[PDB]
Design a protein around this ligand. Structure first.
Ligand SMILES: *[C@@H]1O[C@H](CO)[C@@H](O[C@@H]2O[C@H](CO)[C@@H](O)[C@H](O)[C@H]2NC(C)=O)[C@H](O)[C@H]1NC(C)=O
Ligand code: NAG
Ligand code: NAG
Ligand code: NAG
Ligand code: NAG
Ligand code: NAG
Lengths: 206, 49
């Protein structure tokens, strides 16, 4: 299934502060009004590709999704990144750790790091040797679709991993999300007086 | 003369009222000059004039 992304998916492009200014920047963004593939939870684990970057949004309260896997040959024979909500803390590990082809739990490693009324958005991108994570958490009432609205993402973590990626998978557990790819675009962001991006223009749109 | 992490220049430092997000290190002006910098050894945020 598919559904348009209205405008959300924009993130603070750099680590620099700006206020009350219209700033133009070229970067990997999710173009406005592009379809984003829609998935729902039952039983299976659908496959997804990965190029340039990805924007990944979800809505849930039972922690149905615990994390993610990223890599090229995911079946435990090359270096791959695993993100998981440990129990309350979030852990990231780059290793060739053993997986099934559709892993889920019940109720040579190289890198380690530790940390439906709500909707959580993320952006993952591998550029300049770094793996960069951006996120936003927001209360919502539209359990069905990512709402018509706007809010910028800010980085959660910025790792110097530098591995190759062509695929990724979501991770669940045994006891409703959207994914869309980024493209290089030139954007115009309006930084308000307090320094927060309040609106943006994807001016390759029309 | 001020030097924060190699960002070097001359100016008068003052306490800043800008609300930097936790991942931001300096504020860049319209002329592409740093008008605000975080003290590397503190949470303090200082304005350059
Ligand atoms: C990352 O690894 C994948 C393989 O997992 C590489 O895929 C190759 O891409 C080239 C592009 O021209 C193809 O010709 C090859 O046939 C692909 N190989 C396979 C096995 O699919 C990819 O090139 C790698 N990229 C980086 C940046 O390391
Ligand atoms: C994606 O969106 C375009 C218009 O934005 C539409 O023409 C196309 O059919 C959509 N893709 C699918 C698979 O429906
Ligand atoms: C959290 O992580 C630590 C270290 O990896 C582990 O010992 C602990 O068991 C984890 N939490 C739970 C509830 O298992
Ligand atoms: C990975 O583990 C295997 C043993 O299963 C070992 O032979 C190999 O040297 C290790 N490192 C790499 C890069 O394969
Ligand atoms: C800006 O931040 C101040 C903090 O005191 C707050 O009172 C004000 O409402 C904020 N305004 C906007 C537009 O974010
Ligand atoms: C570094 O500076 C901080 C002040 O922010 C101080 O508390 C800390 O003790 C200093 N480092 C060491 C090793 O003392």
């Amino acid at each position: 299934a598919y559904t348009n992304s209205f405008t959300r998916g924009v993130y603070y492009p750099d680590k620099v502060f700006r206020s009350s200014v219209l700033h133009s920047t070229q970067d990997l963004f999710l173009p406005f009004f592009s379809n984003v593939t829609w998935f729902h939870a039952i039983h299976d684990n659908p496959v997804l590709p990965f190029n340039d970057g990805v924007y990944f949004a979800s809505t849930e309260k039972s922690n149905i999704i615990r994390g993610w896997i990223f890599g090229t040959t995911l079946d435990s024979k090359t270096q791959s990144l695993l993100i998981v909500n440990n129990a309350t803390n979030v852990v990231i590990k780059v290793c060739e750790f053993q997986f099934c082809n559709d892993p889920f739990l019940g109720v040579n490693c190289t890198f380690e790091y530790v940390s439906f009324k709500n909707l959580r958005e993320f952006v993952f991108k591998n550029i300049d040797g770094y793996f960069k994570i951006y996120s936003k958490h927001t209360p919502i009432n539209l359990v069905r679709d990512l709402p018509q609205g706007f809010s910028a993402l800010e980085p959660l973590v910025d790792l110097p991993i530098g591995i190759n990626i062509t695929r990724f998978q979501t991770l669940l557990a045994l006891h409703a999300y959207y994914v869309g790819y980024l493209q290089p675009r030139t954007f115009l962001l309006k930084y308000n007086e307090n320094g927060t991006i309040t609106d943006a223009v994807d001016c390759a749109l029309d | 003369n001020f030097n924060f992490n190699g960002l070097t220049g001359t100016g008068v430092l003052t306490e800043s009222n800008k609300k930097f997000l936790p991942f931001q290190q300096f504020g860049r002006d319209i002329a592409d000059t740093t008008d605000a910098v975080r003290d590397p050894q503190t949470l303090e945020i200082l304005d350059i004039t």
